[PDB]
Each structure stands twice: as C-alpha cells, then as structure tokens.
C-alpha cells in the first residue's frame, strides 16, 4: 500500500448546493476533500443538509472541517459498504492525506503502528497535583 | 387471578391504597376529634 494522490478533476455528486457549505476559512486556512468509488448511482445525505446523488465511479466532495468528512465516511461505510478516503488541502495547494492513515482503518489493528500517549499505569496511580506545581505551565499529573 | 393480584402489589397501586387508607384514618380522626392542638 502507498499513499494515494488526490485527483482534483474527479467529478462530484449531483447536488444543487446549499448554504451549509464552505466559508472564508477554506480560502485562507484549510479545507478537506473526501473521495470514494461508487458502484452505482445512489442518494445519500449530505452532512451539511440535503440529499445528493453519488455518480457511478469516482466521487469528490469538499468540506470545511475534518469531522464533516469523517461523518460522511461513516455513513458511506456502514450504509453502502464503501471505502472513502479524505485529505487536508491548504490554500497554497499542498495536500495532506489523512484517512485511513496507513491504508487500514484504525479500528483494525495493523502492524507497523507505534503506540502514542500510552501510560503504563492505571489512572489511580497518577501523582498528586502538588508534585507537578511550578513546572512552567498548567499541566495535569497525567501528563507525566 | 394470580397475575391480577400481582398487579395490585406494584409500587404505585400499593402506595395509592396505603395513602388512601392513611389519609382516611387521619381525616376520620379529625372528624370525630376536631381542632386538636395539644394532648390532654
């Protein structure tokens, strides 16, 4: 498996538009693109409101925040048995592939993943806040 | 009949009967011993 490359030419689902879509943040900060392959034309629900028709084959939609792309991913995966992926697109044209991060969806354990933010103790074994006082900022005993 | 008497043993029904009885006892005492403020 290798990181896919976004194709901006991909056609988008049939949709008449709405007032729930992108704002000035997309022009200045970042936006998100989700793509998937559809087996047939089918009506699905937009996370921004309304019904859209996915074209047979490649599809492409743009969203304002990451949660919107993953919300549609959950719908497509569970209700239609599809395998979408999405990216983060910066105003200068840079594209950052996001999901699934390593080609395998996170709920399925995969080799080569390195644990992060794992504490080798129980919650009840955290130290008292007095022991981390005056550490340079506000920090919980769970941060050590 | 077993099931019906089981229904009558549910909390709301028992509470209704018990409080109806308790209220009746308190009302009837005040009917025959009106305006009690002290014990003599």
């Amino acid at each position: 498996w290798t990181v896919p490359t976004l194709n901006p030419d991909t056609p988008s689902p049939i949709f008449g538009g709405s007032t729930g879509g992108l704002l000035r943040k997309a022009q200045t900060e970042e936006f998100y693109v989700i793509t998937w392959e559809a087996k047939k034309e089918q009506i699905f629900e937009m996370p921004t409101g309304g019904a859209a028709i996915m074209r047979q084959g490649p599809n492409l939609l743009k969203f304002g925040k990451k949660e919107q792309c993953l919300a549609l991913t959950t719908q497509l995966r569970n209700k239609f048995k599809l395998t979408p992926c999405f990216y983060r697109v910066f105003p200068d044209g840079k594209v950052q592939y996001l999901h699934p991060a390593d080609g395998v969806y996170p709920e399925k354990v995969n080799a080569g993943r390195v644990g992060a933010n794992q504490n080798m103790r129980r919650i009840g074994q955290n130290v008292n806040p007095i022991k981390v006082k005056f550490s340079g900022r506000m920090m919980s005993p769970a941060e050590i | 009949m077993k099931d019906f008497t089981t229904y009558l043993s549910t909390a709301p029904v028992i509470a209704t009967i018990w409080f109806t009885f308790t209220a009746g006892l308190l009302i009837e005492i005040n009917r025959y011993f009106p305006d009690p403020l002290v014990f003599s």
Binding site: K65, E67, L70, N110, Q118, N119 | -
Partner: protein
C-alpha cells in the same frame, strides 16, 4: 490541543476507536492484554474533546482519558 492518554487497563476492545468522530485513536499491537492490542492516540491535534471515547470504554475505571487543553480552530470544531 486536548490531551488524550491510554492506560494499561485497556482490554483492546476497540470501542473507543470506533466511537471517535475525529479519527484521533487507533489500535496497535500489544502483549499486555488477551486481545494483544492496545488503544493509541497518535493524532491528538484533531481531538475536539467530545469524550465519546470515554463513554465507550468498558473498563472500570476508564482506560482512555481526555484532559481538555488549549483551544485552536481544530479543537474548537470551527468550520470558519
């Protein structure tokens, strides 16, 4: 960004990963539990702090914990 930590009481049931609406968590190989897998929090810059993961965790007390931290556009969930 919020702070998400996984503790060694995890049973590797995967329910926190399935419940995360932001894809913050994932399952990695482990040897400390029967399932031989542990939850991980590699992408905490995207955590919004909803705590759906904590709601999904079966262990007592929790094995995944969210500590709300500094607020950015991502953590605040803004689309503008």
């Amino acid at each position: 960004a919020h702070i998400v930590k996984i503790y060694d009481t995890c049973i590797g049931c995967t329910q926190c990963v399935r419940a995360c609406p932001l894809d913050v968590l994932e399952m990695v190989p482990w040897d400390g539990c029967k399932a031989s897998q542990m939850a991980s929090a590699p992408r905490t810059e995207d955590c919004v702090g909803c705590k759906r993961c904590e709601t999904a965790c079966p262990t007592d007390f929790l094995s995944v914990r969210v500590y709300l931290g500094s607020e950015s556009t991502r953590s605040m969930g803004l689309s503008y």
